Structure 1
């Protein structure tokens, strides 16, 4: 771990880092949320904002210090604050932003600023390529409704890493976290669909646990079986 102001950064693979930010949300403690930073040749790609604009600007500061290449785009994985709370900071920095069309639709009512561009998805869940131009190694997949109706996931080609966002919790988790906007009927199938989309990913990264093996997926799905 690298502490940088109030955030934490951890290298996961040669061109991949996890960003972590915290929100002291009254009645729950200081909640960590993780996203990703990927160097693709001469540019940087970001998955998820931090909770706030200020924290997200700090992610960009860390990138400037440690990588020193332009951030070409960011993709955010649903319309909750931990994933989209820093959209304004990305826009102020001139970064092109992407989210599930449904996330952009939901953003205002969730108190979020929408991304600039909307991703749409084929019936099988893979992103429609025209809507994710220049995504390089980021392979975006909609696994079905789970943690939220709009949750999306991202594999990183050239690595063993797939990012489940808030859909997936680690193999030791006692709960599925914030289910306030969850789809209880479809959660288990959506967790399993994420696993099936990225079958060779041995490192599973997620919002509210440290990186884990694929047991994160099986355990999450087995816990989600109890929601039905």
Structure 2
């Protein structure tokens, strides 16, 4: 009823949307992994009379449900999707998207890592993102590579019309007590990568983490703090 939806509020297989700003929604789904249930976020950005999707809903059936929820709530076609790193919460569902008319994109680094690890592989490569600090425009967003953090390939997304920063899994929510799944992370570089985000997007008004509740710019400093203490 208007609050940001939480993990025990979303059965696995259902998707909810949350209006962030004019023409900007997050999507929230839940998935089981290694016997625990987790929420995850993605983004939807209006692109004229089309939609740009950022990240899958963490699985084929969740992603089909996402497309149905978009049709119900928004009613514009998703024409393109960008996956912000190679993990299943970002690319699991790319095959569903590709069969539903959506052109799927990721950096070459993400595509190589997805292929090597046996995850679904976006079709199109996003060049111009291979060096930390790189930025490219993609429809109504800017894509930014901050450097290694949660993963070596992680991208963040800015919506300039709304000053919305989608941090993906490089950014944690304010209640986080650890740095999440750090198996592919660079804990030593992660604070430097967060500092790059802070420097590049100082006017962000909403910051959306990969998992959990949006907030403001404090999510960036909190993330740096938890990662440094995790490493400690």
| Residues 193-212 of structure 1 mapped to structure 2, 5 A cutoff | 193-212=196-215
Could you tell me which residue of structure 2 aligns to residue 218 of structure 1?
221
| Residues 7-156 of structure 1 mapped to structure 2, 5 A cutoff | 7-27=15-35, 29-120=36-127, 121=129, 123-128=131-136, 135-156=138-159
Q: Does the 8 A contact of 1:50 with 1:83 survive in 2?
A: yes
Structure 1, unaligned runs of 5 or more: 130-134
Distance 1:69 1:128 in 2: 24
Distance 2:136 2:89 in 1: 25
1:167 aligns with 2:175: no
Q: Does the 8 A contact of 1:148 with 1:182 survive in 2?
A: yes
Q: Does the 8 A contact of 2:136 with 2:142 survive in 1?
A: no
Q: Does the 8 A contact of 1:50 with 1:86 survive in 2?
A: yes
Distance 1:44 1:12 in 2: 15
Distance 2:115 2:74 in 1: 33
Q: How many residues align?
A: 222
Distance 2:54 2:132 in 1: 22
Local SS of the residue matching 2:98: helix
Distance 2:202 2:121 in 1: 31
Tell me by how many angstroms 1:144 deviates: 0.2
Tell me by how many angstroms 1:122 deviates: 5.8
Could you tell me which residue of structure 2 aligns to residue 132 of structure 1?
none
Distance 1:197 1:98 in 2: 23
Q: Does the 8 A contact of 1:141 with 1:197 survive in 2?
A: no
Local SS of the residue matching 1:18: strand
Tell me by how many angstroms 1:70 deviates: 1.8
TM-score normalised by L of structure 2? 0.89
Tell me by how many angstroms 1:170 deviates: 1.9
RMSD: 1.8
Local SS of the residue matching 1:59: helix
Local SS of the residue matching 1:167: coil
Structure 2, unaligned runs of 5 or more: none
Tell me by how many angstroms 1:128 deviates: 4.7
